[PDB]
Amino acid sequence: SDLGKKLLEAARAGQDDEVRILMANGADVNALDEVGWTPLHLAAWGHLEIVEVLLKNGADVNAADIDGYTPLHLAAFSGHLEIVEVLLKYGADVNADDQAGFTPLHLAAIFGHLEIVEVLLKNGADVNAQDKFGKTAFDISIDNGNEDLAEILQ
Amino acid sequence: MVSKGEELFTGVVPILVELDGDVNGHKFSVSGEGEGDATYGKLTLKFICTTGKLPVPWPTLVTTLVQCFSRYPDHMKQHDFFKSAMPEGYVQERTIFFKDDGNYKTRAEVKFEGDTLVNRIELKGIDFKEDGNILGHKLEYNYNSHNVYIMADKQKNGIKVNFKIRHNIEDGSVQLADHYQQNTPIGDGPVLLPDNHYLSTQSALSKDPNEKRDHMVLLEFVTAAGITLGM
């Protein structure tokens, strides 16, 4: 699978049309690198048009990396609302944890991304889920003194 | 009114590392020498235990033994905290939790002394099992690629760094080492506080065929990524 390595690199590099070419010529949409990242993990950091192309071509929306992180985790960590939205549209697990130690809601709360918090809640995020430190998203907003968020979360 | 520390890394920079260690009362000292080239994210170092046999596996010390040599792409240069603290340097604090075993606490100063980038560390390990994977030397002599997650800590004028290391056990499974890290500038000058991003790491461990002391030869490549604005 050498086209798959090329696809991982094209996704990392943000080369929208190279991703299109590689997949039309047979590249494995779910190619894996050494840290368990697929092209969709790489694109979750801000490459919206590549996210969309990958999902349309069968990318595993819920693939977990070696640390347990799904693309939705990475999009919440890096603050990309439109990517969060398209991932959820394509069936991303809004409450994925399974060794990550955080749900996407926790990550959005940690970094004060109120719009992402609201989208996650609308898609069924569990406000009572506790992260690996025992904290809910509400607790996180209290610890950060974010009363705009504490408000939204009650 | 902005730091110029990145200009100290345009070429090859010599490195010295000095580690004073104590794990469960087992004391040791490690010295490293080599060089770094941030333009390719490249580190070339050799480490020697100068006090005898190393009482823990070499792989468990790799993260403790200079992230200013990470390659930050041109479009991410405003997110490189490590170089922006130079030459005065930064303090690097960690706790490393070995799952079902003990923990390392480490405190280091990373700074220029002359033309040389120097990493000076104190390490304290407690609560290890003498028959566990660490004091029992059950870890493979190799190293995996990892993702290192970097976040601004504005209240400390620095960064928070979190990641998990997986040490292959010589049998089957993996020993988790959970890293909690904090970096703060030593000087009073301006620093760069980054947006959230990650480093992609890759490390190769080997031996020097002519070295009779306990030692580790290390070749490492690290590139920052995850900020797509301006690519």
Author numbering:
A (entry chain A): 12 to 165
B (entry chain B): 0 to 64, 68 to 233
Task: Copy out sentences from the published article reporting this entry, exactly as the authors wrote them.
All hydrogen bonds except two (GFP-residue Gln204 to Asp143 and His114 of eGFP) are also found in the complex structures of the parental DARPins with eGFP. The structures of the GFP-clamps confirm the intended design: both DARPin-derived domains overlay well with the parental DARPins when superimposed on eGFP. Most interactions between the DARPins and eGFP are found in the single DARPin complexes as well as in the GFP-clamp complexes, confirming that both domains can bind their respective epitope without strain or steric hindrance.
